[PDB]
Swiss-Prot record, chain A:
Positions spanned in the full protein: 93 to 216 of 216
Factors inducing expression: Up-regulated by interleukin IL15 in primary NK cells.
Name listed for the protein in its UniProt record: NKG2-D type II integral membrane protein
Native organism taxonomy: Eukaryota, Metazoa, Chordata, Craniata, Vertebrata
Miscellaneous comment: Is not capable of signal transduction by itself, but operates through the adapter protein HCST. Some families of ligands for human and mouse KLRK1 receptors have been characterized being very similar in structure and highly likely to be orthologs. In humans, an additional distinct subfamily of ligands (MICA and MICB) differs structurally, having an extra MHC alpha 3-like domain.
Main location: membrane
Gene Ontology biological-process annotations: adaptive immune response; cell differentiation; cellular response to lipopolysaccharide; defense response to Gram-positive bacterium; natural killer cell activation; natural killer cell mediated cytotoxicity; negative regulation of GTPase activity; negative regulation of natural killer cell chemotaxis
Curated annotation (Swiss-Prot), chain B:
MF GO annotations: carbohydrate binding; identical protein binding; MHC class I protein binding; MHC class Ib receptor activity; signaling receptor activity
Membrane topology recorded in Swiss-Prot or TrEMBL: Single-pass type II membrane protein
Protein's UniProt name: NKG2-D type II integral membrane protein
Tissue expr: Expressed in natural killer (NK) cells, CD8(+) alpha-beta and gamma-delta T-cells. Expressed on essentially all CD56+CD3- NK cells from freshly isolated PBMC. Expressed in interferon-producing killer dendritic cells (IKDCs).
Positions of glycan attachment: 48, 80, 119
SUBUNIT field: Homodimer; disulfide-linked. Heterohexamer composed of two subunits of KLRK1 and four subunits of HCST/DAP10. Interacts (via transmembrane domain) with HCST/DAP10 (via transmembrane domain); the interaction is required for KLRK1 NK cell surface and induces NK cell-mediated cytotoxicity. Does not interact with TYROBP. Interacts with CEACAM1; recruits PTPN6 that dephosphorylates VAV1.
Superkingdom, taxonomy of origin: Eukaryota
Role description: Functions as an activating and costimulatory receptor involved in immunosurveillance upon binding to various cellular stress-inducible ligands displayed at the surface of autologous tumor cells and virus-infected cells. Provides both stimulatory and costimulatory innate immune responses on activated killer (NK) cells, leading to cytotoxic activity. Acts as a costimulatory receptor for T-cell receptor (TCR) in CD8(+) T-cell-mediated adaptive immune responses by amplifying T-cell activation. Stimulates perforin-mediated elimination of ligand-expressing tumor cells.
Annotated compartments: Cell membrane
Topological domain ranges for the Extracellular compartment: 1-133
Species of origin: Homo sapiens (Human)
Shown residues within the full chain: 84 to 216 of 216
Curated annotation (Swiss-Prot), chain C:
Effect of mutating residue 261 to A: In allele MICA*011, allele MICA*030 and allele MICA*047
Effect of residue 246 to S: In allele MICA*043
Protein name (Swiss-Prot/TrEMBL): MHC class I polypeptide-related sequence A
Effect of substituting residue 165 to S: In allele MICA*004, allele MICA*006, allele MICA*009, allele MICA*010, allele MICA*016, allele MICA*019, allele MICA*031, allele MICA*033, allele MICA*036, allele MICA*044, allele MICA*049, allele MICA*054 and allele MICA*056
Effect after changing residue 114 to S: In allele MICA*033
A molecular function (GO) term: receptor ligand activity
Tissue: Widely expressed with the exception of the central nervous system where it is absent. Expressed predominantly in gastric epithelium and also in monocytes, keratinocytes, endothelial cells, fibroblasts and in the outer layer of Hassal's corpuscles within the medulla of normal thymus. In skin, expressed mainly in the keratin layers, basal cells, ducts and follicles. Also expressed in many, but not all, epithelial tumors of lung, breast, kidney, ovary, prostate and colon. In thyomas, overexpressed in cortical and medullar epithelial cells.
Result of altering residue 112 to V: In allele MICA*004, allele MICA*006, allele MICA*009, allele MICA*044 and allele MICA*049
Shown segment, full-protein numbering: 24 to 297 of 383
Subcellular location: Cell membrane; Cytoplasm
Additional free-text comment from the UniProt record: Recognized by antibodies in the sera of some organ transplant recipients and may be a target molecule in allograft rejection.
Amino acid sequence: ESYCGPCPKNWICYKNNCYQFFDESKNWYESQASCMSQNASLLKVYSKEDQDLLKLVKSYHWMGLVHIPTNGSWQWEDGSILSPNLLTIIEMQKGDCALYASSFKGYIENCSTPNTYICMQRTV
Amino acid sequence: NQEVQIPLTESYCGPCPKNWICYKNNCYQFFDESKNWYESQASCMSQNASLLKVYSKEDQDLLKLVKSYHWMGLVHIPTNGSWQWEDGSILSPNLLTIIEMQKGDCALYASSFKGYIENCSTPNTYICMQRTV
Amino acid sequence: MEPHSLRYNLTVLMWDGSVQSGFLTEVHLDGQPFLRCDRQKCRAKNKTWDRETRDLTGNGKDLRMTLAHIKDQKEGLHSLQEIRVCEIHEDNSTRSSIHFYYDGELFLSGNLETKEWTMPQSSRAQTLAMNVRNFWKEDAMKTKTHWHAMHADCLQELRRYLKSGVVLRRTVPPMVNVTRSEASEGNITVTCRASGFYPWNITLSWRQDGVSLSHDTQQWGDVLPDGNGTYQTWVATRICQGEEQRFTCYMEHSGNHSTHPVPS
């Protein structure tokens, strides 16, 4: 396909997924709310091939990955399991939220710490 | 009318090579095969494109989030001292901060809107760009 | 003239295994405090501290991630520091290094002129060193180019600062005052004071008949900060009464030779 889409005017299109990056630092909750306000969600990582552009992202950003008490496992905002061998998760700060970083890394942060964040609309 | 972001206000992003990043009527692709500037220029042209040109902080704001260093289409003119793009465009006044790093007549792009001067013969990753007609 | 210097001192912290949100960057220009930056902003000692703020906040984040690749001690406070300095000399030649400190002790150094990494010998310095070099290998794009760009960043920033004419290395020549005291046993002590002077380097000694007295036949003030940006020192010697005219205080400071006799 020559055309990438449907996406908002002024969003980044890649393989028919739509992304936008936000420099105003917010906690995970305010971040998730902001993404949803623009008909999006926080970055979900489902594919190394389809989201290979994420290798070239500088610095760390809120993605939509949350830890549940009496769960031990990580899962997305939408209730999806995290797929195996997609992300390496690293303890940085005690918390139940995860920052995305290159290359397919999740750094654990307190959900209350303001951070830059990435929205993605699922095209499903 | 006003910026709502609903499924009715969604467009498709103008014509680009298959599997390229489309954003604000530009197409980009990153290449991890290290090449000199000349092999890089030739590669971009082979796909009916050119090396990254930076003309707008607003329209190319995605370039703020780019990791590492990459060949862009900026070449040195001997007579004066000034730089220009592949297409013969002047470099616009307050777009790039240029750093003397190595003696050279080519420039690597890095975030945020930086040009690092390097030897045109040194292999590097590179970014192709095409304007959507 | 000593070279023009620029330093960046970045600190991240860990409590009981957990890397804290805070980090602090001290910027020093020609050895003087110039900026303090936290996660949110830099501050001087106008709001065109944006550049420094966008930049030094990136390094803090990178060093938060670097510390996360060091979980050898899940107990107590721990610090990690990234210190980059570059210098411009009088010959127009340049120096540039980067040092990593953990709990205030050095474990990795990089001379950016000669591209040469150096470890200390302790088993502790090496495990930290390698931990970090491994994190760098781990596709974290720590290409050769990264370090050559840091080099040219520090030097370009130095030039930009120097050019805005912010901290001058202006000479302030000493005020000199010779004095007499302890008039006893037909013996006098003569004291030569130099005060209010910059820079710090000064020569000051008593001469008998134009010849410098030995170091040992002479008492020596330290070089004390005046507490206004300048320095003071003194030197003294015991002489027989009536030999005053044979004794002079000689001083060199900033290409200025001056001789001061004992006032009668």
